[PDB]
Amino acid sequence: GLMQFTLPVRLCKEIELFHFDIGPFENMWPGIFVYMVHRSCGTSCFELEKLCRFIMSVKKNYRRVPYHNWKHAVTVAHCMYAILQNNHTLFTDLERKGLLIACLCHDLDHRGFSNSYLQKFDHPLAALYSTSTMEQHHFSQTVSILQLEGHNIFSTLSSSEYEQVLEIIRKAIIATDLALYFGNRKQLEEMYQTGSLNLNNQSHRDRVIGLMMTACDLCSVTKLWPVTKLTANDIYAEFWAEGDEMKKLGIQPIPMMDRDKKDEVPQGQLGFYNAVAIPCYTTLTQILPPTEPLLKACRDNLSQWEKVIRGEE
Numbered sequence: 115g116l117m118q119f120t121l122p123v124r125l126c127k128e129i130e131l132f133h134f135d136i137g138p139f140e141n142m143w144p145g146i147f148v149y150m151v152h153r154s155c156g157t158s159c160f161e162l163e164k165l166c167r168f169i170m171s172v173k174k175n176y177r178r179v180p181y182h183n184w185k186h187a188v189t190v191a192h193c194m195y196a197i198l199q200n201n202h203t204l205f206t207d208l209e210r211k212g213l214l215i216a217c218l219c220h221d222l223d224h225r226g227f228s229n230s231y232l233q234k235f236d237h238p239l240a241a242l243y244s245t246s247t248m249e250q251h252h253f254s255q256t257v258s259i260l261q262l263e264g265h266n267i268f269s270t271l272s273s274s275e276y277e278q279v280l281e282i283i284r285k286a287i288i289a290t291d292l293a294l295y296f297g298n299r300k301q302l303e304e305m306y307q308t309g310s311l312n313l314n315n316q317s318h319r320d321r322v323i324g325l326m327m328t329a330c331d332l333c334s335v336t337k338l339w340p341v342t343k344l345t346a347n348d349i350y351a352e353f354w355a356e357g358d359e360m361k362k363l364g365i366q367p368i369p370m371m372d373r374d375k376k377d378e379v380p381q382g383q384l385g386f387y388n389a390v391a392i393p394c395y396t397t398l399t400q401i402l403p404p405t406e407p408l409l410k411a412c413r414d415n416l417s418q419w420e421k422v423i424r425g426e427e
């Protein structure tokens with residue numbers, strides 16, 4: 115009840131900033147996450163005994179992969195926390211509850227491979243879920259952990275508040291399928307331009323929340339250059355292992371996943387910042403003005419990659 119979590123002074127201050135790094139001490143990440151729920155949603159919204167048990171079961175169900183790991187889960191939750199705290203009044207009691215949990219659970223039991231590799235490998239999950247394969251699994255894994263005895267952090271919501279929040283979490287997690295992002299941003303762009311965008315239209319909220327999810331998920335591109343650069347290594351460690359596995363199936367992988375074409379990474383990041391990151395945080399800043407720091411940090415990192423190409427690093 116009266117058990118507020120407290121961070122050391124530097125974390126207490128820096129955790130409020132979009133570009134915060136949660137640090138290399140694994141055993142503080144749970145406290146950091148509870149700190150963020152308590153400040154974002156209230157000390158009341160979850161029972162601490164149940165939340166703490168949910169967090170540790172979620173941690174156990176992330177794998178020891180180079181990038182799609184427990185640290186990614188908490189990093190993406192922290193980005194959502196920054197967006198929610200900078201857009202205080204635009205989001206309902208339930209949405210804050212559901213989105214921080216969605217972000218923590220959005221990559222549960224990720225094996226380090228894309229939806230494409232599952233389909234070409236012919237993994238069972240690819241027969242169970244024809245599209246958004248890993249994302250339907252991540253949501254499925256979220257529901258399984260909530261149904262463990264003592265793990266229902268939502269127990270004290272009405273039947274209808276309970277169905278609302280599991281619907282928020284499902285849409286939230288599916289939306290991290292980047293193949294869905296391109297169309298979702300195009301529609302938000304069109305609706306903001308023409309003036310039709312209306313946050314009282316539930317189907318318009320859905321789209322906005324989806325872009326928030328893409329923005330939090332991609333937020334490695336919004337950190338200080340040393341963090342961005344060192345995360346890129348982990349991202350490529352998975353891409354290249356997947357390329358390795360493509361070649362074992364007798365398929366030449368795309369260059370992104372071919373460790374022979376490692377030379378061309380700087381140019382590939384340019385592509386990705388230009389085609390995905392910049393449009394994502396631009397459209398997000400238009401809809402939610404106070405998220406501008408994400409756009410500014412992304413532009414700075416674009417500029418840092420331009421300097422790598424030009425031999426200046």
Ligand SMILES: CNC(=O)c1cnn(C)c1C(=O)Nc1ccn2cc(-c3ccccc3)nc2n1
Nearest residue numbers: 292334335346349369370375378379382383386
């Ligand atoms: C920093 N975050 C990410 O990179 C990130 C995080 N989520 N997702 C999906 C990405 C991502 O798709 N990145 C891309 C996208 C296209 N690329 C093409 C190349 C490339 C080509 C030729 C030689 C070397 C590389 N590299 C790329 N990287």
Ligand SMILES: [Cl-]
Nearest residue numbers: 153154199202
């Ligand atoms: Cl506050």
Ligand SMILES: [Mg+2]
Nearest residue numbers: 220221248290
């Ligand atoms: Mg994912």
Ligand SMILES: [Zn+2]
Nearest residue numbers: 220221290331
């Ligand atoms: Zn993710």
